[PDB]
Design a protein around this ligand. Structure first.
Ligand code: BR
Ligand code: BR
Ligand code: BR
Ligand code: BR
Ligand code: BR
Ligand code: BR
Ligand code: BR
Ligand code: BR
Ligand code: BR
Ligand code: BR
Ligand code: BR
Ligand code: BR
Ligand code: BR
Ligand code: BR
Ligand code: BR
Ligand code: BR
Ligand code: BR
Ligand code: BR
Ligand code: BR
Ligand code: BR
Lengths: 184, 184, 184, 184
């Protein structure tokens, strides 16, 4: 459990040292691991692959209980739509200053905010926090990123690929409007 | 052998504890592992990948000897059709109350019952047990699940994906009628 | 090295015991491992992935030196055609009585004989040994297996998938005739 | 760290011995490992998979700082184009005499020179060193390799697949001209 973490990070330390990365850079990497993994590390994909559909769906719904509550997207949504969304989400942690999205680039994923603050820059800046999502526009229109999104504070986010976005909207077509009104 | 199981489950215990899952939930997970793996755990895909075609086909035919005997589907079927089916099946264990299939959703797999009882709900309920299969309709018509299937008792089932379903019917086209009459 | 083998086979022994396979069956599996791996076991794909193109190509050409010499297919062929073929081949070992190919089934691979004897049955039987290949017909015509091929003796064979077969013929189009005359 | 290397190479030694490779060949393999891995070995793909987008992009930009400086390709290029290119590059080491590219074959990748000298042979020979790239022609025209490229000295190169080449040019279409003028 905690042994896996310390061993994995030692390898990371050796990697950074082998490539002679700068001190401050190694400190940034260190902080990332602590914030992201919290001293413990699991082969989740492996543990979840041992379970069945129902169990996996129960675990995701529980782990994301807080996130689902903050999101109006699931305001009064179909519980199965919620599950279809959650099971396809990928947990990611961002650091202050990080460029989550860069304007003019091809977008292949959107983000759901669990906890943290991001600045949307296209024009003047704008703030988005817990509950809200961003990066859905290019997913609907297939165009380029309509803005850059720099991380303001430590951000605990859940991303969704364009493929998974579309696969979920293939099963719940009318839930597409929710994303459209936010972007329209 | 048994060491792999206990080690894998300890990681599972740590995972559940790390995510502060409720007690009763951890008990449900515990029961699943015992029913599904039975105290022993093997990297089957790995062991089978070391063998050859014939050996793998012999093992599947033997391991599923009981299942093949209960199924009328293989009533008087071509032994090679049986093998083509077995090699593509995925063993799964379900718990009482579990939703194996949910009505109105996109279906991507069907199920063959080795041992257990399921309730088919669309209308009044219906029971299906050893030997029978379910979830084939959307696989033939490509529509939505025509009913929900909640697990009544511990169910030891073998699933078949739509792709594998079609791949097998590409090699044994006339065996498609068997599935159709059950659903017609 | 040899430790990896003994450990891997112990897991295999536990697997067979867990599934209560018959004695004679466990003996057949045992003989397979000894003939196929010869007491030593390597993560080849892993070792080869650490090397570069040239090294990997040198190793395959050396390991298959004997096989290339027995094959008229490479009679006076382009050395690069030989390499293109070798790098895509998969080493397989078959036991006496084994059905390598079954008539009327969809074929997805052909075989090159390094050492051993096979019986081609469609009509009366026919024998093929070192140097010769079989199962190319359905690969050229895309039809069904034109015959069954039961292993007569321990067979050390190298298989080639239909995809790899075609990919190699895309780069060496005229080498297709060699396969055609054998099947014509 | 260094333990992983020595253990991995011992397996390599056993592999070479198991296949009775010649002495000089085993010496060539030995030299490759030392030049390529430098006594240390990391599961990079694994370490990088634990990080996030930004961190991974920072690491690649730093590790390839020297390579980016030697390349005119990035003369005054968009920093994001540089990143898009770097993240898709695969580090490879070649030995003196090695055939990196063979004339008349289907090309599926191009190469960027970090350090070393190659001979381009189609006609008389030609030398290319640090900063320059080669093998882009067939990537633009989809034809066959217009020349062979034998490694003159130890070459530390970064390859780019045709798919990744095109994916990067889909996001930075006008950067295609840079490759064209070099090949025109
Ligand atoms: Br946005
Ligand atoms: Br966007
Ligand atoms: Br913060
Ligand atoms: Br955080
Ligand atoms: Br809907
Ligand atoms: Br049904
Ligand atoms: Br259905
Ligand atoms: Br029960
Ligand atoms: Br059970
Ligand atoms: Br049929
Ligand atoms: Br034949
Ligand atoms: Br054939
Ligand atoms: Br024999
Ligand atoms: Br043998
Ligand atoms: Br040719
Ligand atoms: Br060139
Ligand atoms: Br070229
Ligand atoms: Br040199
Ligand atoms: Br070097
Ligand atoms: Br551009």
């Amino acid at each position: 459990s905690r042994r896996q973490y310390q061993e994995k990070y030692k390898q990371v330390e050796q990697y950074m040292s082998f490539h002679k990365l700068p001190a401050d850079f190694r400190q940034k990497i260190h902080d990332y691991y602590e914030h992201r993994y919290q001293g413990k590390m699991f082969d989740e994909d492996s543990i979840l692959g041992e379970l069945n559909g129902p169990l996996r769906e129960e675990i995701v719904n529980f782990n994301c209980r807080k996130l689902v509550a903050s999101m109006p997207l699931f305001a009064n949504a179909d519980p199965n739509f919620v599950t279809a969304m959650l099971t396809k989400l990928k947990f990611e942690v961002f650091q202050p200053g990080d460029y989550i999205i860069r304007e003019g680039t091809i977008g292949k994923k959107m983000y759901f905010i669990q906890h943290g603050v991001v600045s949307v820059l296209t024009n003047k800046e704008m703030k988005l926090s817990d509950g809200s999502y961003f990066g859905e526009i290019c997913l609907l229109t297939r165009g380029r990123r309509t803005a850059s999104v720099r991380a303001d504070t430590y951000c605990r986010l859940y991303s969704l690929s364009v493929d998974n976005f579309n696969e979920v909207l293939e099963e719940y077509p009318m839930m597409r409007r929710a994303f459209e009104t936010v972007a329209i």
